[PDB]
Amino acid sequence: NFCLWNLQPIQGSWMGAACIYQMPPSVRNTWWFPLLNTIPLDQYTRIYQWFMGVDRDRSGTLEINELMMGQFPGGIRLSPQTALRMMRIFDTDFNGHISFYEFMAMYKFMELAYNLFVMNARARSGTLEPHEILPALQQLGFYINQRTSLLLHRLFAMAFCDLNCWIAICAFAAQTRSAYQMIFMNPYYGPMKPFNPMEFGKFLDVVTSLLE
Amino acid sequence: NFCLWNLQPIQGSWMGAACIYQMPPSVRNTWWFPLLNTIPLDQYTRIYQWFMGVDRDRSGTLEINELMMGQFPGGIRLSPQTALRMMRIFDTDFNGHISFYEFMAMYKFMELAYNLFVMNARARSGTLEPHEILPALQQLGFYINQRTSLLLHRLFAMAFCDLNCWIAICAFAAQTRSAYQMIFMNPYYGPMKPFNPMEFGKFLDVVTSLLE
Ligand SMILES: [Ca+2]
Ligand SMILES: [Ca+2]
Ligand SMILES: [Ca+2]
Ligand SMILES: [Ca+2]
Ligand SMILES: [Cl-]
Ligand SMILES: [Cl-]
Numbered sequence: 001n002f003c004l005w006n007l008q009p010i011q012g013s014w015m016g017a018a019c020i021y022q023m024p025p026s027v028r029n030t031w032w033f034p035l036l037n038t039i040p041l042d043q044y045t046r047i048y049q050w051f052m053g054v055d056r057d058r059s060g061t062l063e064i065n066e067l068m069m070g071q072f073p074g075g076i077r078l079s080p081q082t083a084l085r086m087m088r089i090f091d092t093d094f095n096g097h098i099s100f101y102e103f104m105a106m107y108k109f110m111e112l113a114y115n116l117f118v119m120n121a122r123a124r125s126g127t128l129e130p131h132e133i134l135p136a137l138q139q140l141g142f143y144i145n146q147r148t149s150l151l152l153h154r155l156f157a158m159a160f161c162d163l164n165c166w167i168a169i170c171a172f173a174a175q176t177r178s179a180y181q182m183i184f185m186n187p188y189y190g191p192m193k194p195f196n197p198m199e200f201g202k203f204l205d206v207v208t209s210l211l212e
Numbered sequence: 213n214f215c216l217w218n219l220q221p222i223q224g225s226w227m228g229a230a231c232i233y234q235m236p237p238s239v240r241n242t243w244w245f246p247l248l249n250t251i252p253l254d255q256y257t258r259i260y261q262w263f264m265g266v267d268r269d270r271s272g273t274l275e276i277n278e279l280m281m282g283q284f285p286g287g288i289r290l291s292p293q294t295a296l297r298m299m300r301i302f303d304t305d306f307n308g309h310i311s312f313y314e315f316m317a318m319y320k321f322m323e324l325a326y327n328l329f330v331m332n333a334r335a336r337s338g339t340l341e342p343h344e345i346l347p348a349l350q351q352l353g354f355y356i357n358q359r360t361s362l363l364l365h366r367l368f369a370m371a372f373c374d375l376n377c378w379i380a381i382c383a384f385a386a387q388t389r390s391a392y393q394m395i396f397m398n399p400y401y402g403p404m405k406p407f408n409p410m411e412f413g414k415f416l417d418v419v420t421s422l423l424e
Contacts, residue, residue, distance in 0.1 A: 015333050081424055085424075088421060109305055172422070175421075175422055176422055179302070179419070179421070179422055182418060183415060183418060186411065186414065188408065188411045189401065189402075189405070190401075190405075191401050193400070193401070193402075196400065199398065199400045202398065203395060206391050206394060206395060207391070207419060208421060209300060209387075209391070210298055210384070210387055210388055210391055210422075210423075211422075212297075212424065
């Protein structure tokens with residue numbers, strides 16, 4: 001719009017630059033960084049309060065044991081496997097710690113996943129049946145096929161897939177996205193191509209098949 | 213040598229061409245095809261006898277249930293997961309059948325893996341301890357790192373890794389090789405680069421991390 005009363009924020013607004021330049025390069029370079037600009041300041045304090053509840057030794061950081069022990073929004077809990085996936089996604093420094101800014105990303109990611117869970121649990125509230133996994137993952141940007149969606153339900157769930165199992169699936173898909181980023185940063189594979197969600201979906205189908 | 217008495221066979225000898233051109237394109241195009249030229253004719257009949265023992269419905273082909281039920285050389289047995297990996301490696305036609313030529317490859321692969329198992333089970337006969345997995349896989353051509361070798365022992369074994377568990381590991385590494393072949397055949401990633409075992413080793417490290 002060119003309407004004065006309805007002006008939308010632009011990506012990379014000058015007002016955010018101060019904050020952005022102070023952030024660690026690892027954080028700024030990562031595929032999930034744009035999650036950070038979706039969070040209003042007024043939710044900052046809520047997320048920070050949550051962070052404090054998970055940070056059991058008050059280190060100002062989250063370690064894998066804290067993720068395994070933590071309660072997250074919507075009653076989400078993480079198995080040891082899933083806590084490790086969250087570390088591999090969000091500890092972009094590879095130091096074994098999740099910083100507050102890294103947790104903010106993880107929190108938003110979990111809230112996106114939770115929203116799609118509730119939206120796609122239509123046959124039975126609080127569970128995803130196998131046929132609901134495909135659309136929920138597509139909505140999140142993971143363009144997989146039916147074969148793959150049924151394989152993920154089988155690997156990560158039982159009849160139905162509860163919220164925790166859904167978050168496990170989403171963490172696997174996101175860790176594969178990080179792995180993809182790492183692989184294609186290797187200069188052996190030529191100049192880095194822009195991300196193509198359809199091509200990445202095919203990559204995710206293939207890597208999923210390696211899990212069985 | 214230029215010695216008449218000690219002439220070595222050359223790869224792609226004219227005498228094998230008749231056979232090679234009659235083979236299905238899927239088989240000829242696959243990364244494991246050179247396994248086939250390592251098998252002398254006199255072992256043909258032994259492998260065929262073994263094939264017949266696994267082929268329970270005499271279809272002239274092996275299906276996944278036959279792999280799950282089959283006994284292979286060295287007392288090797290395949291879990292459901294590993295039988296499926298063997299299908300993903302060797303059913304290059306994607307028809308759900310392993311042909312005799314596809315089984316020949318699988319048999320040779322298993323014999324290579326079995327030989328390295330016996331060679332590397334030094335601390336205790338009939339088992340690989342975690343530190344023996346790294347050299348055995350390097351000997352097979354899979355250039356992984358220590359982190360990865362210990363992750364594979366953890367994922368696929370217990371204290372020690374028996375033969376069947378080792379074959380499971382080898383099948384995972386080989387299925388990842390097939391996956392790599394498939395991924396890099398996609399024209400999105402540019403002209404296909406020649407295979408580089410060191411670069412592939414790094415790829416295997418990364419994909420291994422996705423299994424936990
Ligand atoms: Ca802490
Ligand atoms: Ca970190
Ligand atoms: Ca059969
Ligand atoms: Ca076949
Ligand atoms: Cl589909
Ligand atoms: Cl190493």
